[PDB]
Design a protein around this ligand. Structure first.
Ligand SMILES: *[C@@H]1O[C@H](CO)[C@@H](O[C@@H]2O[C@H](CO)[C@@H](O)[C@H](O)[C@H]2NC(C)=O)[C@H](O)[C@H]1NC(C)=O
Ligand SMILES: *[C@@H]1O[C@H](CO)[C@@H](O)[C@H](O)[C@H]1NC(C)=O
Ligand SMILES: *[C@@H]1O[C@H](CO)[C@@H](O)[C@H](O)[C@H]1NC(C)=O
Ligand SMILES: *[C@@H]1O[C@H](CO)[C@@H](O)[C@H](O)[C@H]1NC(C)=O
Ligand SMILES: *[C@@H]1O[C@H](CO)[C@@H](O)[C@H](O)[C@H]1NC(C)=O
Ligand SMILES: *[C@@H]1O[C@H](CO)[C@@H](O)[C@H](O)[C@H]1NC(C)=O
Ligand SMILES: *[C@@H]1O[C@H](CO)[C@@H](O)[C@H](O)[C@H]1NC(C)=O
Lengths: 217, 369, 99, 99, 49, 99, 50, 49, 39
């Protein structure tokens, strides 16, 4: 079991208009569409964690980001209390499958199991975890990052991979394991999304950032 | 249209014309399994309301007309749908939740409802689309000494979100004195047993409840009923039925770049523009069948009964069928009036510099600039 | 939809009076254009000599080279106002294109 | 300089775009798609939702026709002024100040 | 004690916007027009006074 | 003597007073107060009354805006006449009889 | 009221076009006053001898 | 929702409420102590950019 | 017309660029690029 957690070094950085996902599974082209959902606000304060780990809150959805080329980051742990008492997700990647389990694993009754296709393979890995109405949605996107430090300037819409009908309570989360990652929290926001002629979200406007964007909305 | 028996000289806007569909096309996913509704409604014991089961039903053909033979219930209480139409339309995933409550608490199993069961045991969403089934079980879930195997929750620090479960039995703290695992004067057990005896009234008798929850259409469809499919035709005005999406129009191959998680496409006025076929993964446009407006150009009824017809906005190559004269206009196209090279003053205005009149040529309706 | 039409038939004559109002507006627009521009009884034309005491009038008299006999200032005013085509030449035929 | 005719074009475009975009509204019904309402429900409940959609779309179309009538009255007044200016400025010489 | 209806108008979503030209500017325009037509005649309307 | 400007004041004053007074109507619902409807009924039984109040208040607002548009057209015509009288009677001498 | 706002969102764009009509009226009033009164280009003043 | 202010309105002893022209409550009486309170809406307005 | 935040008043008088209220207009000017309000 041991401890071997190597403290936790915190820092703060800027989101830089990042963390936008497709709100539904409907094709739309050459149209501006207004959506009210749980979005990461533009130019928000996201927290950078380093490890060369106490419990982090799950505040109405989590934006996760990692710029790790060395490929040490491998998984996530969700739930409320990490024991054999309360229900808790156990997303572990074995480089071939994603095992998802609800009861316990002792962190060295049961209702749900799942298995999947590999998520992963100078790259940026973005994730959105959301818990609404007994569901659990994961959005993801890979990006060929350049200019290594901090989050890039631009847009990259997050396509969904998996929607998981878990149906339990989430308040806290941990991460499996040099290792550095960005954590931001989603807020209920109204966005104005721009679709190009190919159906790809290219630009967005956050209606509650400044008076100019409220005028645009 | 004028509601009169005499018609004066001029042009009048009559009813529109449509092209009728030829055949009907049904497209359903290639699924042959049968949904196990029998093992949900026929079990020896059901769970309590604080520990309700949740069975996932997917990748099968569902027949909802066999539910009536399986359990003796009066009605089939649906929100958002109807019990008759469940065999035609179809979903992505079905969820079955079975539990046992009292007779007074059946009205609490409803969207937008509060109470004891709705706040502490089982909460339904406000946008619930699904069917609740409840039937009396005083002969199976009751004992003359009192059935004590069914429990329910009275105390909780907060309310419950829709579709959540509470299993843990911790001692409730009603005051400032801590409990620490001791049920004292201010501490009580959160779970209390139902009292089910056959001598009780019908409002206190046990009731078995099965709730079916439907996910309408966001995923590829896996639970679709026994409706057979038909071969796919294109470039023709037909009725279509794609996984319960009905309509009338013309289907053709498309250059739309659908992302692999997208199964629909919408327009500005919230209508379906493109669709993916559920059997072969191809994208089809949906274009409404050819139409337009029909105008009638006439002199007075006291003058003549001759008539010309203008199909406005319609090329006469698209016109199916009415005189022997066909003229092309920028305002539509004209049938029944011939074109002359002379120019007169405008008698009956058609448009784009084109007017029409009725004169001797013996007498006929002519069109001119 | 046949059911929607059958329930729409019970609301009376709202559609007929809306159609009558729109037809009155459409006839009134042509009446406005006719009463503004058609004020001359005969189509006068300029002699081929183009001397008017030193005044030019070259920019407002029509150019015969173009298929539409508009002047230079008229062509400028037509180019500057970004007027839509408004579906005149077979808008359904344009909508049939697989674009 | 030509903002008046551009506004004439833009208002006529914007009213039609508003009328098209108004069809996506539910007006208290379960859906804005008419075939979805007919597929989901039986006859009486679908008739109720159809009646809600019919009333909403009828009110929207009546609003469009009323705004078109007021704009047509304004355009007719402007056309009467233009016809008077064609009669007096072009066909004659005016002694009226600032006319 | 005497309740004003303008407060009930304001509290229920109904506001009144002020005009762009104040009464002093309208009076200055009127004074300029009247001084021009007194000291020059109709010449100030066709060009310089 | 100044009855027209007093009527201009009084029309807008009584229109705003009528718009305020229209909030007292129930429009077929159980109450004209929205908080009492939300406090008395649950969500499903109160959404019908809230929709009835919404439709009634929306119709009253449509009526106010249409009347304001018609009065604005009349005031625009009167202002155009006043501008013509400023240009012709004040900035020059008029030969028009009784203008 | 939040519930009334959520139910009012289902009625489309009535409240926006009412605002557009009233904004057009409010601009037109200033245009009327400027067209009537602001006809002179310079502010003439009378000499002190009356 | 609003701001409660101590009032000088002369409520009769049989009267418990005071209402406005637009069918809204202007004054209320406290159920525990015999006090009359004005209810005004909180500060609002319009924002132009 | 109310409270104006973000534009600083000047003791000059130009033609109206953006109307605000009772004799007050606003504009965007060079003499650093900035938004000003004036009569
Ligand atoms: C009347 O106006 C036309 C157009 O402005 C003049 O035609 C131009 O004349 C200049 C030289 O005088 C040429 O360089 C141009 O090519 C001519 N055409 C155009 C389209 O500009 C014409 O000369 C004027 N008439 C007189 C008598 O000067
Ligand atoms: C985020 O918050 C911390 C808290 O002190 C602050 O120091 C930091 O500057 C913030 N980041 C920003 C404003 O980008
Ligand atoms: C479930 O999560 C909510 C978060 O809002 C929390 O208030 C509640 O106490 C949690 N319940 C349990 C049993 O963990
Ligand atoms: C859309 O896709 C085509 C072909 O893939 C490409 O040529 C075009 O540039 C794309 N448009 C964008 C990215 O806006
Ligand atoms: C069902 O039919 C479609 C169309 O021929 C075919 O592509 C698909 O493979 C079939 N499915 C199975 C399981 O045979
Ligand atoms: C359930 O199944 C058993 C055998 O599988 C059958 O005898 C019985 O009639 C069924 N129904 C009920 C209500 O028990
Ligand atoms: C009408 O149809 C013909 C034949 O298809 C086509 O060539 C033409 O472009 C169409 N439109 C017009 C305005 O003639």
């Amino acid at each position: 079991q041991c401890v071997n957690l190597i403290t936790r070094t915190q820092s703060y950085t800027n989101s830089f208009t990042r963390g936008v996902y497709y709100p539904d599974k409907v094709f739309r082209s050459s149209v501006l569409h207004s959506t009210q959902d749980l979005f990461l606000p533009f130019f928000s304060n996201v927290t950078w964690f380093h490890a060369i780990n106490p419990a982090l809150p799950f505040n109405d959805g989590v934006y996760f980001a990692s710029t790790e080329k060395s490929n040490i980051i491998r998984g996530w742990i969700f739930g409320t209390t990490l024991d054999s008492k309360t229900q808790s997700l156990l997303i572990v990647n074995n480089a071939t499958n994603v095992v998802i389990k609800v009861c316990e694993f002792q962190f060295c009754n049961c209702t749900f199991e799942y298995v999947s296709q590999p998520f992963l393979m100078k790259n940026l890995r973005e994730f959105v975890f959301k818990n609404i109405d007994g569901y659990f949605k994961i959005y993801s996107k890979h990006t060929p990052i350049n200019l290594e430090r901090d989050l890039p300037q631009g847009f990259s819409a997050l396509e969904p991979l998996v929607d998981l009908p878990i149906g339990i309570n989430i308040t806290r989360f941990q991460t499996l394991l040099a290792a550095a990652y960005y954590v931001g929290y989603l807020q209920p926001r109204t966005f104005l999304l721009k679709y190009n002629e190919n159906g790809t979200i290219t630009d967005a406007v956050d209606c509650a950032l400044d008076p100019l964007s409220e005028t645009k909305c | 249209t004028l509601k009169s028996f005499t018609v004066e000289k001029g042009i009048y806007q009559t009813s529109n014309f449509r092209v009728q569909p030829t055949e009907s096309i049904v497209r359903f996913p290639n699924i042959t399994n049968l949904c196990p509704f029998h093992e949900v409604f026929n079990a020896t014991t059901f769970a309590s309301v604080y520990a309700w089961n949740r069975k996932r039903i997917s990748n099968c053909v569902a027949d909802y007309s066999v539910i009536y033979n399986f359990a003796p219930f009066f009605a089939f209480k649906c929100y958002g749908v109807s019990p008759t139409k469940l065999n035609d339309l179809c979903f992505t995933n079905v969820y079955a939740d079975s539990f046992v409550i009292r007779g007074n608490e059946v009205s609490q199993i409803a969207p937008g409802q509060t109470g004891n069961i709705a706040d502490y045991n089982y909460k339904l969403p406000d946008d619930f689309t699904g069917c609740v089934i409840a039937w009396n079980s005083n002969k199976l879930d009751s004992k003359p000494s009192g059935n004590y195997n069914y429990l329910y929750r009275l105390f909780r620090k907060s309310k419950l979100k829709p579709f959540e479960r509470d299993i843990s039995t911790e001692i409730y703290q009603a005051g400032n004195r801590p409990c620490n695992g001791v049920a004292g004067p201010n501490c009580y057990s959160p779970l209390q047993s139902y009292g089910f005896r056959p001598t009780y009234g019908v409002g206190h008798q046990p009731y078995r409840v099965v709730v079916l929850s439907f996910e309408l259409l966001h995923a590829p469809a896996t639970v679709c009923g026994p409706k057979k499919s038909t071969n796919l035709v294109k470039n023709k005005c037909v009725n279509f039925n794609f996984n319960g999406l009905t309509g009338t129009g013309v289907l053709t191959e498309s250059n739309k770049k659908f992302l692999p998680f997208q199964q629909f496409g919408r327009d500005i006025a919230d209508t379906t523009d493109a669709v993916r076929d559920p059997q072969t993964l191809e994208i089809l446009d949906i274009t409404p069948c050819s139409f337009g407006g029909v105008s009638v150009i006439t002199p007075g009824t006291n003058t003549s009964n001759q008539v010309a017809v203008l199909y406005q906005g319609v090329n006469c190559t698209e016109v199916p069928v009415t005189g022997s004269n066909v003229f092309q206009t920028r305002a539509g196209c004209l049938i029944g009036a011939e074109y002359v090279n002379n120019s007169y003053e405008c008698d009956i205005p058609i448009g784009a510099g084109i007017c029409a009149s009725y004169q001797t040529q013996s007498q006929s309706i002519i069109a001119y600039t | 939809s046949t059911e929607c039409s059958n329930l729409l038939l019970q609301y009376g004559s709202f559609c007929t009076q809306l159609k009558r109002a729109l037809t009155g507006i459409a006839v009134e627009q042509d009446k406005n254009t006719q009463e503004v521009f058609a004020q001359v009884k005969q189509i006068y034309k300029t002699p081929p000599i183009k001397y008017f005491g030193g005044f030019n009038f070259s920019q407002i008299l029509p150019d015969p080279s173009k298929p539409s006999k508009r002047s230079f200032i008229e062509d400028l005013l037509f180019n500057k106002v970004t007027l839509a085509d408004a579906g005149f030449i077979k808008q359904y035929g344009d909508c049939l294109g697989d674009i | 300089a030509l903002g008046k005719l551009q506004d004439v074009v833009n208002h006529n475009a914007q009213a039609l775009n508003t009328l098209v975009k108004q069809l996506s509204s539910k007006f208290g019904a379960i859906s804005s798609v008419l075939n979805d309402i007919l597929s989901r429900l039986d006859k009486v409940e679908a008739e109720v939702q159809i009646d809600r959609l019919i009333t909403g779309r009828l009110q929207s179309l009546q609003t469009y026709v009323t705004q078109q009538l007021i704009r047509a009255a304004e355009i007719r007044a402007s056309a009467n002024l233009a016809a008077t200016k064609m009669s007096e400025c072009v066909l004659g010489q005016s002694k009226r100040v600032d006319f | 004690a005497a309740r004003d209806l303008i407060c009930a108008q304001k509290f229920n979503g109904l506001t009144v916007l002020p005009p762009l030209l104040t009464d002093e500017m309208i009076a200055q325009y009127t004074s300029a027009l009247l001084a021009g037509t007194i000291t020059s005649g109709w010449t100030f309307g066709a060009g310089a006074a």
